[PDB]
Amino acid sequence: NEVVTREYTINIHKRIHGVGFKKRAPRALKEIRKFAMKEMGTPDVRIDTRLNKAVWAKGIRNVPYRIRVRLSRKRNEDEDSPNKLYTLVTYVPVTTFKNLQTVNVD
Amino acid sequence: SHRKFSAPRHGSLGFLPRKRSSRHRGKVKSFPKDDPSKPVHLTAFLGYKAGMTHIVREVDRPGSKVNKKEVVEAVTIVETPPMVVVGIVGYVETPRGLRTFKTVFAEHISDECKRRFYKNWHKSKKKAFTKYCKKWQDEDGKKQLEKDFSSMKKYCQVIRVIAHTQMRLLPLRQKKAHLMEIQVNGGTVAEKLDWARERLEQQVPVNQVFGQDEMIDVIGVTKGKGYKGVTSRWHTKKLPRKTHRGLRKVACIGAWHPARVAFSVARAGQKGYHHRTEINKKIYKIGQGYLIKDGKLIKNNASTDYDLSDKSINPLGGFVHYGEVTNDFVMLKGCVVGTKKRVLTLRKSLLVQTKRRALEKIDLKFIDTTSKFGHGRFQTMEEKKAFMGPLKKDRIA
Amino acid sequence: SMLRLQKRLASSVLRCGKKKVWLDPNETNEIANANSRQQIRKLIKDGLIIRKPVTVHSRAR
Amino acid sequence: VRYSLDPENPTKSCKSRGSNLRVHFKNTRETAQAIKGMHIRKATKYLKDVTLQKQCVPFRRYNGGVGRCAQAKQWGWTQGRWPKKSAEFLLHMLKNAESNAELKGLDVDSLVIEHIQVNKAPKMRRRTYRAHGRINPYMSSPCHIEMILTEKE
Amino acid sequence: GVCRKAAQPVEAGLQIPAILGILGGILALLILILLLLLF
RNA sequence: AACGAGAUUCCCACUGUCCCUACCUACUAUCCAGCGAAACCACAGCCAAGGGAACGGGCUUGGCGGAAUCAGCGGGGAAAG
RNA sequence: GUGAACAGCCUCUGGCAUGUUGGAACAAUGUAGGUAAGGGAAGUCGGCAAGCCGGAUCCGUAACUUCGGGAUAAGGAUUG
RNA sequence: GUGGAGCCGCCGCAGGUGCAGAUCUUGGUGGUAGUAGCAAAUAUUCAAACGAGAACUUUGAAGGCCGAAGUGGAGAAGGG
Ligand SMILES: [Mg+2]
Numbered sequence A: 001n002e003v004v005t006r007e008y009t010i011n012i013h014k015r016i017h018g019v020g021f022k023k024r025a026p027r028a029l030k031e032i033r034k035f036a037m038k039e040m041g042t043p044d045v046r047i048d049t050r051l052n053k054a055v056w057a058k059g060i061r062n063v064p065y066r067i068r069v070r071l072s073r074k075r076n077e078d079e080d081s082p083n084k085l086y087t088l089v090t091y092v093p094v095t096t097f098k099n100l101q102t103v104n105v106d
Numbered sequence B: 001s002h003r004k005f006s007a008p009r010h011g012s013l014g015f016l017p018r019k020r021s022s023r024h025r026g027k028v029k030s031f032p033k034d035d036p037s038k039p040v041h042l043t044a045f046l047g048y049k050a051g052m053t054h055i056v057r058e059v060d061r062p063g064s065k066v067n068k069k070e071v072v073e074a075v076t077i078v079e080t081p082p083m084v085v086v087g088i089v090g091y092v093e094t095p096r097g098l099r100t101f102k103t104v105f106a107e108h109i110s111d112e113c114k115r116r117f118y119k120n121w122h123k124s125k126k127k128a129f130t131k132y133c134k135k136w137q138d139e140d141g142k143k144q145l146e147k148d149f150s151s152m153k154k155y156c157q158v159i160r161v162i163a164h165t166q167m168r169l170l171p172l173r174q175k176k177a178h179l180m181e182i183q184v185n186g187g188t189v190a191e192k193l194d195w196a197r198e199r200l201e202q203q204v205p206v207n208q209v210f211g212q213d214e215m216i217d218v219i220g221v222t223k224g225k226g227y228k229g230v231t232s233r234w235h236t237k238k239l240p241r242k243t244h245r246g247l248r249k250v251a252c253i254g255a256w257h258p259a260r261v262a263f264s265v266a267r268a269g270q271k272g273y274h275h276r277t278e279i280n281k282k283i284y285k286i287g288q289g290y291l292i293k294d295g296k297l298i299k300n301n302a303s304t305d306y307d308l309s310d311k312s313i314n315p316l317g318g319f320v321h322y323g324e325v326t327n328d329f330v331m332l333k334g335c336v337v338g339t340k341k342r343v344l345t346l347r348k349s350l351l352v353q354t355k356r357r358a359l360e361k362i363d364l365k366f367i368d369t370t371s372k373f374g375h376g377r378f379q380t381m382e383e384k385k386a387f388m389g390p391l392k393k394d395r396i397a
Numbered sequence C: 001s002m003l004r005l006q007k008r009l010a011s012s013v014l015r016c017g018k019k020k021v022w023l024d025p026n027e028t029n030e031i032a033n034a035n036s037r038q039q040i041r042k043l044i045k046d047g048l049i050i051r052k053p054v055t056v057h058s059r060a061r
Numbered sequence D: 001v002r003y004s005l006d007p008e009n010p011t012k013s014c015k016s017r018g019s020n021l022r023v024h025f026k027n028t029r030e031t032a033q034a035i036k037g038m039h040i041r042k043a044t045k046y047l048k049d050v051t052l053q054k055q056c057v058p059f060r061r062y063n064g065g066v067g068r069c070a071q072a073k074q075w076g077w078t079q080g081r082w083p084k085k086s087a088e089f090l091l092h093m094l095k096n097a098e099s100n101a102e103l104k105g106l107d108v109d110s111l112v113i114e115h116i117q118v119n120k121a122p123k124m125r126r127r128t129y130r131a132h133g134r135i136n137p138y139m140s141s142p143c144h145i146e147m148i149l150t151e152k153e
Numbered sequence E: 001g002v003c004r005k006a007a008q009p010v011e012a013g014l015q016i017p018a019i020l021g022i023l024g025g026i027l028a029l030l031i032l033i034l035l036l037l038l039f
Numbered sequence F: 001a002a003c004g005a006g007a008u009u010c011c012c013a014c015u016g017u018c019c020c021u022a023c024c025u026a027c028u029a030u031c032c033a034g035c036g037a038a039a040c041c042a043c044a045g046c047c048a049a050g051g052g053a054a055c056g057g058g059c060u061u062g063g064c065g066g067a068a069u070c071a072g073c074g075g076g077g078a079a080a081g
Numbered sequence G: 001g002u003g004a005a006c007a008g009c010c011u012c013u014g015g016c017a018u019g020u021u022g023g024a025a026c027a028a029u030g031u032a033g034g035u036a037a038g039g040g041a042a043g044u045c046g047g048c049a050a051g052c053c054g055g056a057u058c059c060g061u062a063a064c065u066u067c068g069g070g071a072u073a074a075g076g077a078u079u080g
Numbered sequence H: 001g002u003g004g005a006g007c008c009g010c011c012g013c014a015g016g017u018g019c020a021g022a023u024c025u026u027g028g029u030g031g032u033a034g035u036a037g038c039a040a041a042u043a044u045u046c047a048a049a050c051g052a053g054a055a056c057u058u059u060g061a062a063g064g065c066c067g068a069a070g071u072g073g074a075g076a077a078g079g080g
Helices: A033-039 A049-055 B111-117 B139-145 B147-155 B189-193 B381-388 C004-013 C037-045 D025-032 D040-051 D086-101
Strands: A005-011 A045-047 A066-075 A085-091 B044-059 B069-071 B074-080 B083-094 B097-105 B158-164 B179-183 B202-204 B216-221 B226-228 B269-271 B275-281 B283-287 B328-333 B342-348 B364-367 D013-021 D111-120 D124-130 D134-140 D143-151
Touching: A005 A033, A033 A045, A033 A085, A049 A066, A049 A085, B044 B179, B074 B342, B083 B147, B083 B179, B097 B147, B097 B158, B111 B158, B139 B147, B147 B189, B158 B189, C004 C037, D013 D086, D025 D086, D025 D111, D025 D143, D040 D086, D040 D111, D086 D111, D086 D143
Parallel strands: A045 A085
Antiparallel strands: A005 A066, A066 A085, B044 B069, B044 B074, B044 B342, B044 B364, B074 B328, B083 B097, B083 B158, B083 B202, B158 B179, B216 B275, B216 B342, B226 B269, B283 B328, D013 D143, D111 D143, D124 D134
């Protein structure tokens, strides 16, 4: 029942591999969803369009190998689903992924 | 009629049911038969192939043109943690074959054994052998437990031994012990059976079972290749390019009047993951791994008489898709059935041989521990950074 | 909530293509109320329908 | 109207019907032989997991070409499939019966599914186009499905 | 109408695809592959 | 002579045509959700030998014979058209 | 824009949503596209099929001929 | 038992007089089979809205395609 928020790195170069050239960036977003439903534990995951543009920034078949995201478990309203928590996955840019490790943010 | 040009059969019918084996661990189909005039000894042993390297040895073969020269030979290495004896099984011969007389297990069985008795250890209450361990201490079950070695000693003519692997000592992510049942082919049935009551829940090393240059047989399950067609499962010649509906097919699969497809014809199916026994694999070295912590850690494997370095047979970068070997090992000339990380039972050979290729000694000159994860050109890390110099790895101190 | 009519009328009255029209996707039901060309010229002056200019094709290189 | 096999106690029994509705017949027959004799709370919860593919429908009779799944081991079968359109129509009809149970004055914690049959509806046709100038039909096979709900007490 | 996609239309047509199924197949002897059997 | 998507023989270069195959990619096939035909069909569908309209799935004497199926396959049904 | 070019390739104005469905996996057999050590037509009814060659510039161009040709013969060298 | 308005026996009379086949005619329904198939022309993704309900509607952002002999903008014939 938390509302907590963390930030991670997602290497996409590992999690899509042996994928065809036209399925390479669309799998890169349903492997952000399968990351965020395993971690935060909710089926309802919303990603925003700046994280959409950050994966599609180089066409389909060249996804940038690693991205820095943050995940926001939140609660909902107005005749919500039988699960009332959902994750907002948004994009934070960084120039270096070396020595960055998944910190809990406030 | 009469093919005009004779060929031989493609593939052997001695291995006909090209089927996935009904086992992951290689079954011993035959232990070597005994004369009871010998001292008392085990016959098989479980092992794990880790990867392959090669060798340099001064070959000794009088008559040959290789004689008194150095030859490189491909070896596999088989990591062998010691077996721990758990059970004793009796077998009485019938006119319907051998029949299990009864089994007696150890006083307290380990935890890696009890995991083999479960398809879901996590959903378990781990209640196996709780009622059986009490009869070793309860006097009523104990004075008939000593009866069921005396009934064992009287009636059954071959006894065997249940042992397992110590899976904590491996880099594998399995932790279920592989529980094998191997035959003690020594002397008479009294000496054969009081040599196994003596050593329940104790360790058995591999050099107590095998030796250097003592040629053995390797039993395993092959590299599984999946569902492949005729030209890979049976190695049939490809059809010419002009063929309609397909190149990689066997064209005529029979005549008209047997009016049925015969068993001796080739067609698609499961290739690999078959049970095989290789024969006549000579042992080149029984290495032992990583002794005590006073002499902080002697790595000291692969250190031949002519090397005298602080090398160790785990190569520079670790064995590819296996891990890093910390236990005793057996190294074997030649290829060995299996994938890496695969259980394989080393076993003494049934046939006797002298043949002047077995029973001759070998002395190693060299073992490369260069990287197998690429085209490695350095063998030890001190040998690299003396040749490489200092790098930008430090750049502050 | 069809906005197919307003998209067609705007690109005819801005003298542009259907491709170069209309940023600000918030006010959906306000511009979906307008059905006429006289109503649609009012939304242009309120800035709820803009032109979205030409894609860059620099002759620099 | 009149059903097949009028119940043994019509006072504490419920019934529903839907005619002429467009499902496949061969998928609805075998998802209804899965929930026959099943309690209404296990039946409503089983049908949700067919749509979520957590639990399957074994195809026992109409099984030509039906693949094999690991979830048919609960039924002691080998072949199974997950008809999500068929498990929604006899879930929407199972809601109608427990609406009739509380209008007939029945407890829903004791309702099991006594009788359920699927039988074929008259086929409605349209046509496709095959080679060499020939017409052949795409006839649909709808069904009439029908159920009695009976309290056990 | 209020009852014209419900009570005009289900009468209107609903069997009008039934033009013959097959009108013979006048494609002139599909055994065009010359076979001719030993002559 | 010049010209041939004309017929043929040799030579150079070139190559997976071949020795001798191997590997990679896309699309299918495969599995699932929806939707869904047709050809064909006496009844049907395991063999050997015998006799028989002389080349049986059934008859005769033998061999024998466990539900239900999946992916393939091209021996047979003297398969279909 | 490149270029001899209304070639092909890439963009702008103007259109479109991949051609009567999606999702997961990446077996055999296919269809379409490629590579291959050494050998180089031994394959095959047959060099079938594929591959070599290719633009321009500067040289150099044989038999034969109806004196027009053959001829971009053949064969080289260069190219940013 | 269903059904709801006609029917039958005997004596003579008269036939468009009794079906298992005709690659019969017409209509209906099976097995095959929940199978073959829904594979030519590179490609979609994210959010929101409207909605009982959204892989497919509209909108916005992105990535792409046609690339001026167009997948653009107009007509003739034909359709109505
Ligand atoms: Mg044996």
